[PDB]
RNA sequence: AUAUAUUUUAGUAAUAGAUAAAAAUAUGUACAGUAAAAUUGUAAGGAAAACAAUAAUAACUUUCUC
């Protein structure tokens, strides 16, 4: 492999969801890798 | 080439049960190089042992 | 030889059975055969007479406030084989006056010493787990035992686990408590209340739950062996709100009945207080705004929690309320 | 003030002591308890399954009375495993000669000799002086435990060893003796008689058990 | 099957083991397991009697000490730092033995060196 | 499995909770181990422990009078140095290690009357190096050393592989006994009584096999096992014998106040000078 | 003491602890606990086998004691 040129797409994870927004039963929050932040009330 | 002793399926032994080892024990006489005679508890089946080279005869532990 | 007196001394210190007495002092395994097939370990004898001479030597060097005086008492006694004999292996629950008596301090002790070792701490495991505490009334401090019984409705007899399902028949009518003190208190002028809430009825106007007062006592007498809170005892000037069974409606959860014990504020004979019976507010109901009220000490809990089924409807007719709501069985 | 150097030198006990009654009882059932619970003497590795030693072993010993279809144990089946009935305690019995012990009292037979050091084997004696009597005192260029040291060095000729050059008491000295007005030897209880209750007061702390 | 040996070695491997040599563990009456428990607490409390006797003794020799240091270094300077040196290097007899059972023959030495 | 995210919900009450007893699964290990009614109840206190009556009558008010000096507080050792707060960025920032070392370090307490230097706890490994090869060789020295103690060791199994000696991981290699109590006192007695002396050459521990936290060590031969009474009277029984290393705990703050005290129990540390 | 019959033991095989960083079980649940490195040591044993030791007790509870 002369070249590299390999790699894959973003994961598009982060915050779905603000401070103050409003949610229904099952809407996701938040996407991430590990749990940079945990589940509340 | 490893010699070893190939192992059967062992006893599980439950939580609780687990009983612990009191080893079969004699009390034993231990007569030293002189006349002090001390008790011990061993388990080899012997009453009385005398001992010929001690601490009590060796130059090291006694300097008179 | 002051295990052997038995003159201010009360005469639970010693066990009843003389037979046993013998034995312990130079069995009880009924069977002829497995006593002839026993064999108890050797030079137990003597050395059992030496250490009861050491013990018995200890509490009579101990024997001489009041708190302090009683754990005196119970530190003196103890180690006393006899009482250990009684304690252990005799009910707890239906207390028999000379075999344990909860007047004499070391018993009590014991009792409490048992309570801690595994019934309170299920009953605390129960209040967290169910959400009881935080949810009715901010947190308790154990002190005392309180078992539940309904003994009226079907007949049978059990004392209530505590966070147990109880059928609708079951929980028909009223029930019946014992709250076992402990921690040296007053028994004449100190006075209680009980208090059976269910926090988890639906309120549809705010679209959460309100909190019902289904029975409560107040201005109870209590006694350290006589604890026993029937009809007999508490007569109806006491009932502040007289009993209402559990009545879930269908498809609204597991409704959790707590019973909550409080001992009056102490200030010459028993301190009475009225309650405004007509006034206070059963159907919706605030426990920690009538606590601030009258300045109640929650001492002790027990809790069940009941769910709707076939019978409850014949319940509600036979106390003639409404024919009770249905709800949607989606948590939409 | 004037500096007195004293002295407590003491015998260590050259025995196990003699227990209480109560003690020895427990210690008793103790052993007792052990032997209950012991396991089989496994004689299969000891003892070797035609040797004359083993074979000598086994004549020694009386086996356990084994089950047989058609009797009554009215004291339980024997449950036997190994050459042994689980349900008790199992007990084995047993130039060349046997091992006879030295008495532990030659101060008793003595019955006399308070200026002895074959007194009281299991205890811990303290020389004493008369002259109210007490310990050697002796009345500053030497340190003070050396110097003491020297001092009694001088009215035998006897073997002694500092414990260390730091004091106790009101400046005494602690030493230990290695080898052989009145020399007087003495336990703690002993020395409680012969002393002023005061003086015992002071220095009852030093003298052990 | 197995070599003689092997035997051998299995047959010490079961020396240690519990498997066949334990005997049936013991049950009680209650009242003797009453007994039991209230002799093993007699037991308890005189150990603990001992403990604090010991550990009073030396906490009184401790505090004689620290008097006589105080003293000490007040009077004699000299003296008081003489009985300071750190024994960093000090070692028992070795002559002065660990008690026996039962007495030697020549109970005591008198001549030495 | 949905969640993999731990997370203890917080609590409302001061009550402790030992949840095993709410459990009714094992109801023998609900009483304590020394409780007659369990299984694992064995007796503590069959007779008395002549070292340690020696070491408690004699020794521990001599151990007291040599160590105490006279107001010597406590010199606490070298820990984790907090960061100088002159930049931002020593905020939230872990310490700094120690300046000597990478580990922390104890403070060494004055020897007072409640800490007095006593024997704590005794430790015996006999790594059998020719188990590589041979597996119930590990077997005869687990057994060995049974006989030699009293008390049921532990297998000591290979933790590492390398290549240069036939070492692979997972082989059983040699026993592990810890002894502590009555049992470890009469060890010791027979290691200073019997062993020690019968050595040939034996000149006494080295003065340098200070742990420096006040432990002690030191090895003995495979030939001196065969000194050992419950091997002495068998020698038929016993072809191979192991030599072992011998480990000795101490409450002792320091190492030479262990070695004091270990010479109050006739050893000799004529090996060297500290 | 010795003979016969009938049975009982001896197949000897580990962990004896809710085991906790050697191997072997990779999915459920229930209960529990902490790793690693580095340093100082110790028969053969050292750069590199195994074992041991290496952070603070302020407050609290029970027990024993002046
Ligand atoms: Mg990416």
Known sequence: SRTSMKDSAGRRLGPKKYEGQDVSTGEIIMRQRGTKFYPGE | TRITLPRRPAKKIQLGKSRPAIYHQFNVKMELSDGSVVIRRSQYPKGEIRLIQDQRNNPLWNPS | ???????????????????????????????????????????????????????????????????????????AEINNPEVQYNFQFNNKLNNVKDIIDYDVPVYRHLGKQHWESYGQMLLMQRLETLAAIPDTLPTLVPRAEVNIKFPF???????????????????????????????????????????????????????????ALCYGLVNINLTYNDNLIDPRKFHSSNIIADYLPPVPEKNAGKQRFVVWVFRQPLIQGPNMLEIDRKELSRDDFDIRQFTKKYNLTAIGAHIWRSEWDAKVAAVREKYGLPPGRVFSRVRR | PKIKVGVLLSRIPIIKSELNELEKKYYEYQSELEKRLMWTFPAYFYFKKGTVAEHKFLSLQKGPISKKNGIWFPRGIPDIKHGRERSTKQEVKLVNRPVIPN??????????????????????????????????????????????????????????????????????????????????????????????????????????? | S???????????????????????????????????????????????????????????????????????????????????????????????????????????????? | PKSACSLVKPVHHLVKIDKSKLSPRFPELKYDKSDIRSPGFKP????????????????????????????????????????????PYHLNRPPKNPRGSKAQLPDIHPIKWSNIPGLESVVINCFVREARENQLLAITAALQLQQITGCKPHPIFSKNDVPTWKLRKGHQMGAKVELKGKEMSQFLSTLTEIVLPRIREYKGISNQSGNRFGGISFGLTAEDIKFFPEIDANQDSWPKTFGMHININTSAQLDYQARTLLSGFQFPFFGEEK
């Open chain 3, 1 to 75: 030889h002051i295990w052997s007196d038995f003159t201010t001394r009360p005469s639970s210190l010693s066990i009843q059975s003389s037979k046993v007495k013998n034995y312990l002092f130079q069995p009880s395994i009924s069977r002829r055969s497995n006593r002839i097939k026993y064999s108890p370990p050797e030079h137990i004898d003597e050395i059992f007479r030496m250490s009861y001479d050491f013990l018995e030597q200890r509490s009579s060097k101990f024997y001489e406030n009041p708190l302090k005086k009683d754990a005196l008492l119970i530190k």
């Open chain 3, 153 to 211: 409705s079907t007949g049978v007899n059990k004392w209530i686990e505590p966070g147990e399902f109880l059928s609708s028949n079951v929980t028909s009518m009223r029930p019946i408590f014992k709250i076992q003190e402990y921690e040296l208190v007053n028994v004449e002028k100190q006075l209680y209340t009980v208090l059976i809430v269910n926090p988890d009825v639906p309120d549809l106007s705010n679209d959460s739950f309100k909190t």
């Open chain 4, 103 to 209: 008495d532990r009292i030659t101060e008793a037979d003595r019955s006399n000799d308070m200026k002895s050091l074959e007194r009281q084997l299991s205890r811990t004696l303290y020389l004493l002086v008369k002259d109210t009597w007490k310990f050697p005192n002796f009345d500053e260029s030497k340190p003070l435990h050396v110097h003491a040291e020297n001092e009694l060095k001088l009215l035998s000729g006897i073997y002694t060893w500092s414990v260390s050059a730091t004091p106790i008491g009101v400046f005494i000295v602690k030493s230990h003796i290695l080898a052989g007005e009145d020399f007087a030897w003495l336990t703690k209880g002993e020395i409680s008689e012969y002393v002023p209750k005061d003086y015992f007061n002071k220095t009852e702390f030093l003298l052990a058990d």
């Open chain 5, 2 to 113: 197995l070599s003689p040996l092997a035997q051998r070695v299995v047959t010490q491997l079961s020396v240690m083991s519990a498997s066949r040599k334990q005997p049936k563990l013991l049950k009680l009456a209650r009242e003797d397991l009453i007994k039991h428990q209230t002799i093993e607490k007699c037991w308890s409390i005189y150990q603990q009697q001992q403990r604090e006797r010991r550990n009073l003794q030396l906490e009184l020799q401790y505090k004689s000490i620290e008097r006589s240091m105080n003293l000490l270094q007040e009077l004699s300077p000299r003296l008081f730092e003489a009985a300071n040196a750190s024994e960093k290097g000090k070692r028992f007899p070795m002559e002065m033995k660990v008690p026996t059972d039962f007495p030697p023959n020549t109970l005591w030495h008198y001549n030495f060196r």
């Open chain 6, 44 to 87: 503590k206190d069959t007779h008395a422990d002549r070292l340690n009556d020696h070491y408690l009558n004699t020794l521990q008010s001599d151990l007291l009078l040599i160590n105490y000096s006279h107001n010597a507080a406590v010199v606490k050792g070298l820990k984790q140095r907090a960061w100088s707060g002159d930049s």
